[PDB]
Each structure stands twice: as C-alpha cells, then as structure tokens.
C-alpha cells in the first residue's frame, strides 16, 4: 500500500494569510493526487484533482502543486469558511489511500471562558444516578482544564468531557464536563465543585454549589 | 447539478449483512466510475471499493479489509451504485459515503455494527442558576442521556433560537451508551419572561422529546 502523510497534523492561521499544507507519498504517484475539504459531519468536498486542476465551482485562492512523491495545496489568503479538515488521496493504484488530514483553524484573541456548573436534575435523581455538569462557553486558545471536587476531594476517573469547534458563528470553542456519580454517594457529599484553568484568567475560577441548597 | 444519496444504513449485528444504496443524478452515470469510501474517528478516510464503466468492463477493486465480504454493484438503468456487506464487523462501523470519480461525494449513511441494542435517551434539566443576579448572562441546557446508536439531533425552541446554541459531541459511556448536552445563554433578566424548550429527536429509536427548562 502507499502510505500518504499529510503535514502538518494542525495548524492556525489568521485572516487573509497564505497558508500550504503538504502531502507525501511512499513512492511516486504520478500526479494521480487529490484535495479535499470537509467539515465536521458533512462529506469531503474535492477542491484539486491530479494535483493541480480546479474543480468546477472551487475559489481560485486554491491551488495545488508537486509531482512525483511530494505535493502541497496552497490557500492564497484563508477566508473564513476555509476553516476545517484537509485531505489528500492517492488514485495511481489500488487501493486508493489517504492521508490523515491536517486541521486548519482560524486565530483569534485569547477569551476566558464563562463557566457554569449544574446540579443533577430532580428528574434524574429518581432512577439512581447523578449527573453534574459543567460547561466552560466561549474560550480561546483550546488548551483549559477542568478539575472536579466533592467536599474538597479530587476526583479522578469519573468524568467525561467534549469540545466545539470553531463554525460559521463562533471563533472560540466551547466545553461540556459531565461528572457521573451514583445516587447514594451524590447524598453523602454536600459541596460540588468545577475549577477551571485557562490563560485567560488570571487564576483558575470556582464554581460551585451545595447540594440542597436554593 | 451532480446529485448523490445513500441509503441502506444503520444498526446491525457482528456478522449480519446490510445492503447500501446510492441514487445518483446530473452526470451520464453510465460513463462514471464509482467508488464507496468510509469513514470513522479511529481510521480516518478509508477507500472500500470501486466499480468501473464500460471502459474496463465494469470491473470491481475492493480493500484488502472487506475482499469476500462485500460486494460493489451498480444498475445503469435505475442510476444507483451498491455495496452488500456481509458478515459485518465491529471495525465495519462508519459513515459510508459514495462518490463519483472521486469529484463528487454523497451526505453519507451511518454504519452502526454493534451487539447492542438500540435505545432512546433520557432527557434532563441543565437548569439556570438562583446565584446570577440580573443584568448578566445565564447559562441553561439539556442533558440527552443513556442513548445507542448515535445520533442525536438538539434544536431550541423549535429552531427559533439559535444564538447562544452550544450541542456537544457525544461521550461514549462505559455502559456502552452515549450522553451529549446542549447549552444556551441568555440574559438572566430573561429567565423570568422567556420560555426555552429543547427538541430533542433521535431518529434510531423513533424517539423525540421537548424538554422545558426552568429556574430551580
Ligand atoms: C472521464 C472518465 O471517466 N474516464 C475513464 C477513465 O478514468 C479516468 O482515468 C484517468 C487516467 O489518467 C484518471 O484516473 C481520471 O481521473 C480523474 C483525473 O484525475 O483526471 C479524477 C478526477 O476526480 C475527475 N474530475 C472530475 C471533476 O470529475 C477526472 C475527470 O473525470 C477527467 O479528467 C475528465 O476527462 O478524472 C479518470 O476519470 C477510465 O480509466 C480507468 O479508470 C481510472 C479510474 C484509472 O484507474 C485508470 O487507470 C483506468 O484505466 C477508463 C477505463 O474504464 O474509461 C474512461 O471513460
């Protein structure tokens, strides 16, 4: 098989900036190379096919160049929709292979998150788990830690957490943590508490609240 | 416009069979070659088959990974494309897509191969905060939880809000079922005064819910 690899894994670039990703196969593949675009839960998109030729429809800020085993695609100046993952597929041989994708996103100034902690609801109680929430809304750089505590005691192992990306409407990212506890140790605790870490504050930010308490 | 829909996917069991379908429109299909490729967190893009045109005699190429499982088709009459898949394996599980000579790509079908069984979530309250006051910004959500296979669609109020609007991805749960929240923030001066409801629907248990969420 011919592995492809993409370069880089990621990146960001801001507004207007030229940008040139890379794709390299293990032998050479005769221009036989495709680009593609894809957003999260949609299909590719092909932009480029054998290496250099437009696909109808496509802005003419992209553009693809190499031969023999090293290809690049090249956004003259990122626009905003340019967001999302790029792709690169080898069709010399079978089987057609791809590259693993380089995330591009877009820079912007750095926002401390909101932060929000939620109890578990009533509802929930009723069948014999617990789950407290804690949302992190609208932070930029990606990097932030979340860190829960019951009556002062680290939890580890016992939470889950999931991240937005950056859309059409927002440039920051944001952050759900669900901390999943039975009913019967939910009951024996009274102090429920989500501190978050982020560069954008200026020391990592409590929020909290006591079980039974209005 | 080039046009192209799958069909035929879902949940199934390791070592059952499934049947996709691609309708394809705005091009002369029988000139096209055709291609199914798959997709998945774990793997990345993965090319699964292809069939040719009359060029080559219609002739088919499949991944070592599926060779003597599955089996690529087309009718020129009907303009579909096929892929069987017999004897399904975990690894199998993906978004399936179709596409014309690699150009133009359908939305996908999700490919769910899994032992377990389908099942509609719980929705809770993420309710606003007492601890707020007024002239500042409240966060309140819904909690979608305990559902399999994936996936779960959030709107709020019937879709007339949408600023604000954070759904998550899902967690896949040690049970083996997944959990996802969705969030909006409002003016806490609001809470008093608006009404927002969370639609919840998923479509693999013919599940929907509205969920109103309130203060305290
Ligand atoms: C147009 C067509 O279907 N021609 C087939 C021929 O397939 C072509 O083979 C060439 C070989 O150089 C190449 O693989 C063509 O692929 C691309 C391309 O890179 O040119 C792929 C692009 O995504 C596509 N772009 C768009 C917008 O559709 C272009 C485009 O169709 C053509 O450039 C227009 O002329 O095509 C490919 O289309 C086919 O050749 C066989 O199958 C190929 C996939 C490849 O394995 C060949 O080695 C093989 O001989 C022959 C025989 O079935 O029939 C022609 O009709």
């Known amino acids: 098989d011919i592995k492809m690899t993409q370069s880089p894994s990621s990146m960001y670039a801001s507004l207007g900036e030229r940008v040139t990703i890379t794709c390299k196969a293990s032998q050479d593949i005769n221009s036989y190379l495709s680009w593609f675009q894809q957003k999260p839960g949609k299909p590719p998109k092909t932009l480029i096919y054998r290496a250099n030729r437009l696909v109808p429809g496509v802005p003419s800020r992209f553009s693809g160049s190499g031969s023999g085993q090293d290809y690049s695609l090249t956004i003259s100046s990122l626009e905003y929709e340019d967001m999302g993952i790029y792709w690169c597929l080898q069709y010399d041989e079978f089987p057609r292979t791809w590259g693993g994708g380089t995330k591009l996103e877009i820079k912007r100034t750095v926002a401390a998150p909101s932060v929000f902690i939620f109890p578990p609801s009533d509802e929930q109680l009723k069948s014999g788990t617990a789950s407290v929430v804690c949302l992190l809304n609208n932070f930029y750089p990606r990097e932030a830690k979340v860190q829960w505590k019951v009556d002062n005691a680290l939890q580890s192992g016992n939470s889950q957490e999931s991240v937005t990306e950056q859309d059409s409407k927002d440039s920051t990212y944001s952050l759900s943590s669900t901390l999943t506890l039975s009913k019967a140790d939910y009951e024996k605790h009274k102090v429920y508490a989500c501190e978050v870490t982020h560069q954008g504050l200026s020391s990592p930010v409590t929020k909290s609240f006591n079980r039974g308490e209005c | 416009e080039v046009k192209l829909e799958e069909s035929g996917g879902g949940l199934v069991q390791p070592g059952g069979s499934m049947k996709l379908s691609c309708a394809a429109s705005?091009?002369?299909?029988?000139?096209?070659?055709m291609d199914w490729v798959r997709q998945s967190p774990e793997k990345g893009l993965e090319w699964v088959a292809e069939?040719?045109?009359?060029?080559?005699?219609?002739?088919?190429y499949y991944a070592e990974s599926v060779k003597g499982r599955f089996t690529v088709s087309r009718d020129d009459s009907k303009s579909r494309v096929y892929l069987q898949m017999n004897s399904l394996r975990v690894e199998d599980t993906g978004t399936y897509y179709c596409?014309?000579?690699?150009?133009?790509w359908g939305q996908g079908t999700l490919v769910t191969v899994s032992a377990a069984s389908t099942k509609g979530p719980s929705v809770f309250p993420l309710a606003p905060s007492s601890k707020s006051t007024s002239g500042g910004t409240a966060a309140l959500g819904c909690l979608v939880k305990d559902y399999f296979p994936e996936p779960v669609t959030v709107s709020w109020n019937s879709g007339a809000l949408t600023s604000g609007v954070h759904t998550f991805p899902a967690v896949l749960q040690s049970s083996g079922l997944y959990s996802l929240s969705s969030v909006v923030t409002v003016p806490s001066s609001s809470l008093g005064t608006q009404t927002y409801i969370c639609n919840v629907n998923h479509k693999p248990s013919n599940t929907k819910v509205d969920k109103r969420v309130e203060p305290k």
């Open positions: 596409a014309v000579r690699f150009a133009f």
């Open positions: 705005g091009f002369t299909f029988s000139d096209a070659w």
């Open positions: 069939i040719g045109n009359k060029g080559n005699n219609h002739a088919t």
